[PDB]
Amino acid sequence: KDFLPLYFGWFLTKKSSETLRKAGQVFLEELGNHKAFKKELRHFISGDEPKEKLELVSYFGKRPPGVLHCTTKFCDYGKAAGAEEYAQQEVVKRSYGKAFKLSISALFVTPKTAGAQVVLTDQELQLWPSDLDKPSASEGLPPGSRAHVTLGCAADVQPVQTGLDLLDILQQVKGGSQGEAVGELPRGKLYSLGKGRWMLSLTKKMEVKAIFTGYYG
Ligand SMILES: Nc1nc2c(ncn2[C@@H]2O[C@H](COP(=O)(O)OP(=O)(O)O)[C@@H](O)[C@H]2O)c(=O)[nH]1
Numbered sequence: 001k002d003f004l005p006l007y008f009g010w011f012l013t014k015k016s017s018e019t020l021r022k023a024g025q026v027f028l029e030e031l032g033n034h035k036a037f038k039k040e041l042r043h044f045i046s047g048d049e050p051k052e053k054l055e056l057v058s059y060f061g062k063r064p065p066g067v068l069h070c071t072t073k074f075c076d077y078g079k080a081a082g083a084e085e086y087a088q089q090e091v092v093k094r095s096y097g098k099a100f101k102l103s104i105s106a107l108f109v110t111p112k113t114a115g116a117q118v119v120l121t122d123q124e125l126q127l128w129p130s131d132l133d134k135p136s137a138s139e140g141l142p143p144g145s146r147a148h149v150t151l152g153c154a155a156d157v158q159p160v161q162t163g164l165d166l167l168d169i170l171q172q173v174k175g176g177s178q179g180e181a182v183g184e185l186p187r188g189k190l191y192s193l194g195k196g197r198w199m200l201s202l203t204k205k206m207e208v209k210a211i212f213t214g215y216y217g
Contacts, residue, residue, distance in 0.1 A: 004078040005214025009071040016208035024151035028056035043196030060152025104206035111196040118147040
């Protein structure tokens with residue numbers, strides 16, 4: 001019998017990866033230099049500390065090397081629950097190797113991860129794994145809300161954290177707790193959601209090109 005991928009997803013082209021990666025780093029630069037962020041650094045550095053500034057690019061030291069991606073289904077070669085069902089779908093097999101455009105609507109930062117929120121079209125939503133055997137997965141939010149691109153992680157943080165972070169952030173925006181924007185960056189508005197959580201809503205959605213395929217490690 002045949003190995004499944006470690007995970008399925010959309011893998012950005014060289015150019016799109018470069019473009020999104022640069023946007024993420026610029027965001028980390030501006031955020032770290034933003035007065036509202038520094039006023040709340042108690043959520044990134046603990047204890048009575050010298051009043052210095054944190055370089056977020058350095059903070060998120062575990063970064064994706066090379067090509068960026070948006071995961072759909074983690075399969076672990078077929079060991080993960082629902083892995084085979086997902087892989088056997090017609091739409092997954094039909095879409096394998098095909099090009100897509102992913103709309104990135106926001107960039108976010110928590111004390112654990114940094115990433116970009118992806119807003120899937122309905123065609124692309126067809127490639128999002130069914131939560132019907134684990135509605136814990138998407139936590140009351142529309143399907144595919146977890147869709148993201150990871151831009152960086154803190155040293156002690158597991159890779160899957162980014163998706164959980166995004167859902168947490170979106171969960172607040174659902175209850176209307178993003179509050180009044182606390183800053184206006186060149187690319188959009190900065191929101192302070194508390195607990196070291198920050199969201200930049202892009203004025204203009206970023207459009208990235210990516211191939212849907214499988215990663216085998
Ligand atoms: N999404 C997801 N990832 C898992 C799960 N269990 C383990 N992982 C980890 O996810 C890693 C690969 O995820 P990755 O695509 O890099 O993270 P993402 O880009 O934030 O979705 C692997 O190293 C696994 O150890 C799971 O149930 N779901």
